């Protein structure tokens, strides 16, 4: 599923991401935009052989099991393919554990490089939230 901007914002708000650990909703929409272009089926391979999955590009090195990242962890206790669903519940619940691990949203390289220090509230402008 490719989400619309306000559609994703509404779904993220319903699932409790607005101001989670102090990050306003615009941060999460901005991160999703530049991580996956709002596409739940997005995948990208990393140099160490791990793979990033879904709308927030969650990494198989630490967070999910894809059967092909030997020596890695599965801290969200899910198969990585669950992160590609049109239902974003698994991605949001796993994202909540990542952002709580001490580094905040700096865990997402696209957020630090393209969202942090910008007017992230612009990403929800116009939405009925
Ligand atoms: Na893993």
UniProtKB/Swiss-Prot annotation:
Reactions catalysed: Hydrolysis of (1->4)-beta-linkages between N-acetylmuramic acid and N-acetyl-D-glucosamine residues in a peptidoglycan and between N-acetyl-D-glucosamine residues in chitodextrins
Domain C-type lysozyme: 1-129
Main location: secreted
Residues given in the record as substrate binding sites: 101
GO biological process, one term: defense response to Gram-negative bacterium
UniProt keyword annotations, A-Z: Allergen, Antimicrobial, Bacteriolytic enzyme, Disulfide bond, Glycosidase, Hydrolase, Secreted, Signal
Gene3D superfamilies tied to this protein: 1.10.530.10
GO cellular component: cytoplasm; endoplasmic reticulum; extracellular space
PROSITE patterns: GLYCOSYL_HYDROL_F22_1, GLYCOSYL_HYDROL_F22_2
Pfam families from the UniProt entry: Lys
Family: Belongs to the glycosyl hydrolase 22 family.
Name under which the protein is recorded: Lysozyme C
């Amino acid at each position: 599923k490719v989400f619309g901007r306000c559609e994703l914002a509404a779904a993220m708000k319903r699932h409790g991401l607005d101001n989670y650990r102090g990050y306003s909703l615009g941060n999460w929409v901005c991160a999703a935009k530049f991580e996956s272009n709002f596409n739940t089926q997005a995948t990208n391979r990393n140099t160490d052989g791990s793979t990033d999955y879904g709308i927030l590009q969650i990494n198989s090195r630490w967070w999910c099991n894809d059967g092909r990242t030997p020596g890695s962890r599965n801290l969200c206790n899910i198969p990585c393919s669950a992160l590609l669903s049109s239902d974003i519940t698994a991605s949001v619940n796993c994202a909540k554990k990542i952002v709580s691990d001490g580094n905040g949203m700096n865990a997402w390289v696209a957020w630090r490089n393209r969202c942090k220090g910008t007017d992230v509230q612009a990403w929800i402008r116009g939405c009925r939230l």
